[PDB]
Ligand binder design. Sequence first.
Ligand code: MG
Ligand code: MG
Ligand code: MG
Ligand code: MG
Ligand code: MG
Ligand code: MG
Ligand code: MG
Ligand code: MG
Ligand code: MG
Ligand code: MG
Ligand code: MG
Ligand code: MG
Ligand code: MG
Length: 125
Amino acid sequence: ATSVPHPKIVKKYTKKFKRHHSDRYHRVAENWRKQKGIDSCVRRRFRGTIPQPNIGYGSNKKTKFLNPAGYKVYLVKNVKDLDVLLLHTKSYAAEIASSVSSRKRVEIVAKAKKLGVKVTNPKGK
RNA sequence: UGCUGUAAAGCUGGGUCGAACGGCCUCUAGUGCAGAUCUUGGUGGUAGUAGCAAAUAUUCAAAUGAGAACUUUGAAGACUGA
Ligand SMILES: [Mg+2]
Ligand SMILES: [Mg+2]
Ligand SMILES: [Mg+2]
Ligand SMILES: [Mg+2]
Ligand SMILES: [Mg+2]
Ligand SMILES: [Mg+2]
Ligand SMILES: [Mg+2]
Ligand SMILES: [Mg+2]
Ligand SMILES: [Mg+2]
Ligand SMILES: [Mg+2]
Ligand SMILES: [Mg+2]
Ligand SMILES: [Mg+2]
Ligand SMILES: [Mg+2]
């Protein structure tokens, strides 16, 4: 890791917690919703049903919010936004906003390279 | 295209697009949908399916026309049967 050293990153659950029967019906979106029904096999945690979000899956407080490269990602919309990452170049990486123009994005990439700030999305437009 | 969060979700690559829009500190509410034989609109399977079967009955040729079972004319065969 080129960032500040961290313990090995553990993700207790790496899949997406998908709402029950978001596979059965198009009207039911995958966005997680807690079953509230009286008879629900999922709400009652029958064997073979889907896993559900709970605080036990919470991330280690030392590796939380770190991308696979070991950085915390900060959203940048202009070159002045990189000033808050001057003393945090080994723990914070910059991510250029999608709505920044192709002109201003070149300036942000140019200044980040000068400051040593890492950019998580360095190519797009 | 991926990243972050236990999660609600947030951010991002590519495509499309054409005029507005967001972060944060607060304020406010007509603020979150899978159901209500919910409302309005739209779309399926059914399915090229049920079916298009009462009232006797049509046929040959020519003309017209891009095209004629169905139009026009002629010839015939019928019917309504005052
Ligand atoms: Mg019960
Ligand atoms: Mg784009
Ligand atoms: Mg756009
Ligand atoms: Mg316009
Ligand atoms: Mg504002
Ligand atoms: Mg309401
Ligand atoms: Mg609905
Ligand atoms: Mg309806
Ligand atoms: Mg239908
Ligand atoms: Mg039929
Ligand atoms: Mg019938
Ligand atoms: Mg005739
Ligand atoms: Mg007679």
